[PDB]
């Protein structure tokens, strides 16, 4: 251990937990070079993103294998398969872990020496080790009582010059602020109820959206029970977290319960030990998306409307039939109180380890793990038609363009079952010879993973608000699904050693995977790793290590990618489907993904060299690594021309490359006895480059995209995730071509490469003061890089609310370098046609001079990631009390974010498409980010 020949980072429980985050990975967001960590949103308590040395797999498995006490953990994600209309994320598998139960976390960043763990390790390993039994002075009880608040952070920057209206002209029913300039004048607004209409001063409500949000509240309770003997150790823990975030009502909720029992017993050569854990969660999400969702309704509010005034439903003007606008949006408070989107989960995981030392130098370890989960989701929406359409302005008075057509209600329930089994049988041989040392490990590993669900859906509810499968007069919808994959591999690992300073390691493994063709299921991968401590020098150099490694890691495909299938005939049409059966007849179609029985395995090959040194009395340290990864032949469903009879073919890709530098530098410029002061800086720079995608299929394939809109791709010579977007035409001198009649930009025929998803570099900056029992930590997270799509900016441009749209005071304008394109050869002429007041709305909604690509936003940000103020009480105070330790602790997270001036819209730490590669397409009006801060009380007994 720490004779390792590739990059890795150890973090200790206290740093993991001092932030009091509900989650074991969030607090490490910008603190480990090479390890990119992000939250999908600030909605409690959604998934988290952990990608190590860039995206190797497209698509879309790039999470690191989590290993707890020797056993692979399930890190499945539950997020919505349609982030356009119903965004929600219910959690990450790693989020079940109880912080406060972690004793050390070690992230193995390299994929050269991954025989001990399987092919899943190519994405990095997060090697978790839980607290065990220890003798202390008390009874062995640690209690943590937490409490925190979450207020909104970064709401879009709004224009406050123009109120409700369109085309420049005042309106009474708009969802936008393209109306006249604000004056004191008293104007009507809204709909008419009982021959009456509301009259309000036409003024701006600058804090109307800010005042809509609440302060989220979360209380946490953690208990641990601990003790040991010379033959035995026993740890038992419980954690409870309850969060209700800043969106009003309880629709943004997270309950978390964990229970754990860990014990070991030694008796002779024999040690037996077991770890068993139960994990519960309930989630409620304020769905996001382009439809009747809370936030999409919230942003399409004119700047003069008091949003906190739309809540009281006894004011009939706030009813869904008289709500002040009928334009694809309804009252946000009605959505939060009458829609359902719940998820509940039960999880059991654990292991049994049997250790038996024999013949002086041997150890037999048998370790089996089981991980099983049952999750149920229930979501519904009212029959808005039946309740409100008839005889109301927003319903019948808007005819077929009503927000209630055909919103007839639906309810669905899904129960999902997940079960993973791993078995390891190892013999370890460990013997010194002279100055040398030999340690060899041989073993067999066996893996079984299974997932199943049952889904049922009703539409057109009879009682309009009741969510139940009996509540429908129409045919219901069922779906069922399961996947089973199995793996067996055998592996050897030889660690050799000379003196205390020269370490060689040699791994190998060979796996048999069910997900590869029958006649090619076997794939072998070896590695080599060196470590040389060049500390052999007569105090100025505390430590001095040089590393090198070269190794491979194989990988298999996902389930069922080999044979042709026939699916139940359906057809996808824009915004709907036509599915069989009809009418009384069932039917099947040829599956549009072409399987391949000539696949080969995947093979990631990595080279890496590194350098670690420490100076003075450990007052200055640095670690630096240079890596070069190629994930080759990964099995992928590659895009194909539908005229071939299929829309994709499964085949082995070319290489995806990731090379770069990971750098950590820390030092203690002040170390008294009563006082310290540390500083830390870490730096990452990765160079993503898809090297080849099979030529025969064109060399490009979609990761995620909007039909006819902005799309993220993988292209043969470029970094992973390149955006193409809509762009205005230009003449040979670079002037923007505009339409001679409207004055509006004209599309440039083709898209439109406008950046990629990768940060150009990432880095973090941390300090840590310590006086007596006082301690303080301040962390900064800095990533400067690519671009993402932001519907938050899009909808706020379209709606006339973004400050950017108050440009030119909205007086008629000629685009400042316009040109008009003119028998059969082309001619360009200065443009004299202005954009009229009546069309300024459309200039900005389309994206201004940038057009569609306007809504790719600079991913960059600088963020005050976390702050921890710790108060460890003097032991003197506790002599007359049951307490062994009291640590009062005040903290804050995600406190402040600075972006470049081109991003006055979002905190870029957002997505609506999950926690992996597809989530890098961006945010589709995901809920705004939070400012989290609170207190923790720690009482040891």
């Amino acid at each position: 251990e720490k004779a390792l020949g590739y990059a890795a980072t150890s973090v200790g429980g206290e740093k993991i937990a001092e932030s009091r985050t509900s989650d074991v990975m969030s607090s490490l967001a910008g603190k480990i070079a090479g390890v990119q960590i992000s939250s999908t949103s600030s909605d409690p308590g959604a998934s988290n993103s952990v990608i190590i040395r860039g995206v190797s797999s497209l698509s879309g498995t790039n999470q690191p294998l989590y290993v707890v006490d020797g056993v692979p953990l399930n890190n499945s994600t539950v997020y919505s398969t349609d982030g356009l209309n119903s965004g929600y994320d219910f959690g990450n598998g790693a989020n079940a872990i109880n912080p406060d139960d972690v004793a050390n976390m070690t992230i193995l960043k390299g994929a050269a020496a991954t025989a001990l763990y399987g092919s899943r390790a190519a994405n990095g390993v997060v090697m978790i080790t839980t607290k065990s039994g220890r003798k202390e002075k008390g009874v062995g009880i640690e209690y943590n009582g937490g409490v925190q608040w979450s207020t909104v952070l970064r709401l879009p920057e709004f224009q406050n010059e123009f109120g409700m209206g369109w085309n420049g002209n005042h309106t009474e029913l708009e969802n936008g602020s393209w109306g006249p300039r604000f004056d004191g004048s008293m104007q009507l607004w809204g709909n008419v109820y009982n021959n009456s209409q509301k009259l309000k001063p036409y003024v701006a409500m600058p804090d109307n959206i800010k005042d809509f949000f609440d302060a989220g509240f979360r209380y946490s309770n953690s208990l641990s029970f601990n003790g040991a003997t010379d033959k035995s150790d026993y740890y038992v823990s419980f954690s409870q977290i309850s969060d209700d975030g800043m969106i009003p009502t309880d629709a943004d909720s997270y309950d978390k319960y964990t229970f754990s029992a860990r014990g070991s017993h030694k008796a002779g050569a024999l040690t037996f030990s077991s770890s068993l854990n139960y994990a519960y969660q309930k989630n409620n999400f304020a769905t996001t998306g382009q439809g009747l969702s809370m936030l999409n309704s919230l942003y399409q509010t004119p700047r003069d409307i008091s949003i906190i005034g739309l809540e009281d439903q006894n004011d009939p003007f706030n009813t869904p039939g008289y709500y002040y606008t009928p334009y694809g949006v309804m009252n946000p408070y009605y959505i939060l109180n009458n829609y359902l989107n719940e998820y509940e989960s039960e999880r059991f995981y654990g292991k049994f380890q049997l250790d038996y030392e024999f013949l002086k130098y041997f150890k037999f370890t048998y370790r089996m793990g089981l991980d099983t989960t049952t999750g149920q989701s229930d979501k519904g929406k009212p029959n808005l038609y039946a309740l409100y359409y008839e005889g109301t302005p927003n319903g019948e008075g808007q005819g077929s363009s009503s927000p209630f057509s055909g919103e007839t209600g639906q309810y669905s329930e899904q129960i999902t079952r997940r079960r993973e089994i791993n078995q390891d049988i190892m013999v370890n041989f460990n013997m010194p010879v002279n100055d040398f040392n030999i340690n060899a490990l041989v073993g067999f590993n066996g893996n079984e993973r299974k997932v199943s669900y049952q889904y049922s859906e009703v539409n057109d509810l009879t009682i309009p608000t009741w969510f139940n499968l009996k509540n429908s007069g129409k045919t219901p919808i069922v779906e069922q699904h399961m996947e089973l994959r199995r793996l067996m591999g055998v592996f050897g690992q030889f660690e050799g050693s000379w003196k205390n300073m020269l370490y060689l390691t040699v791994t190998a493994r060979n796996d048999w995977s069910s997900t590869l063709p029958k006649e090619n299921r076997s794939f072998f991968y070896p590695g080599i790793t060196g470590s040389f401590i060049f500390s052999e020098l007569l105090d100025v150099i505390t430590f001095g290590k040089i590393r090198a490694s070269w190794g491979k890691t194989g990988n298999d495909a996902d389930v069922y990618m080999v044979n042709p299938v026939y699916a139940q005939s359906s057809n996808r049409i824009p915004f709907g489907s036509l599915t069989f059966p009809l009418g009384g007849v069932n039917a099947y179609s040829a599956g549009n993904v072409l399987g391949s029985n000539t696949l080969s395995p995947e093979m990631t090959t990595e080279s890496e060299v590194g350098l670690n040194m420490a100076f003075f009395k450990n007052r200055l340290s640095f670690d630096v690594s240079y890596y070069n990864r190629n994930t080759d032949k990964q099995i992928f469903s590659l895009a194909m021309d539908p005229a071939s009879g299929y829309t994709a073919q499964n085949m082995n890709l070319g290489k995806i490359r990731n090379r770069g530098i990971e750098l950590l530098i820390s030092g203690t410029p002040i170390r008294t006895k009563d006082f310290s002061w540390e500083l830390t800086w870490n730096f990452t720079k990765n160079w993503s480059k898809v090297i080849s995608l099979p030529e025969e299929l064109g060399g490009i394939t979609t990761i995620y995209g909007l039909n006819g809109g902005t799309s993220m791709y993988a292209i043969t010579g470029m970094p992973v995730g390149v955006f193409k977007a809509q762009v205005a035409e230009r003449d040979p001198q670079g002037r923007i071509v505009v339409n001679s009649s409207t004055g509006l930009p004209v599309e440039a025929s083709e898209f439109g490469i406008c950046g990629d998803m990768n940060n150009k570099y990432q880095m973090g900056v941390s300090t840590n003061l310590k006086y007596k029992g006082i301690s303080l930590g301040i962390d900064f997270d800095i990533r400067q890089g690519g671009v993402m799509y932001s519907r938050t900016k899009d909808i706020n441009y379209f709606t006339g609310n973004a400050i950017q749209t108050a440009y030119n005071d909205r007086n008629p304008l000629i685009v400042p370098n316009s040109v008009n394109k003119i028998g059969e050869n082309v001619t360009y002429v200065e443009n004299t046609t202005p954009i009229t007041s009546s069309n300024i709305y459309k200039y900005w909604g389309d994206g201004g001079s940038d057009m569609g690509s306007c809504f790719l936003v600079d991913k960059s940000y600088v963020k005050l990631r976390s702050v921890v103020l710790g108060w460890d009480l003097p032991k003197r105070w506790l002599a007359k009390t049951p307490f062994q330790a009291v640590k009062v602790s005040a903290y804050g997270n995600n406190l402040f974010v600075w972006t470049p001036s081109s991003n006055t819209f979002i905190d870029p730490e957002m997505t609506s498409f999950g926690n992996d590669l597809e989530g890098n397409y961006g945010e589709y009006t995901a809920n705004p980010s939070s400012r989290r801060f609170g207190f923790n009380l720690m009482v040891k007994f």
């Binding site: 708009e174 382009q290 334009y327 995620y704 909007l706 039909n707 809109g709 799309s711 709606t799």
Partner: peptide
């Protein structure tokens, strides 16, 4: 990819 819809105003 999959489709989105315009707004109203």
């Amino acid at each position: 990819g999959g489709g989105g819809g315009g707004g109203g105003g």
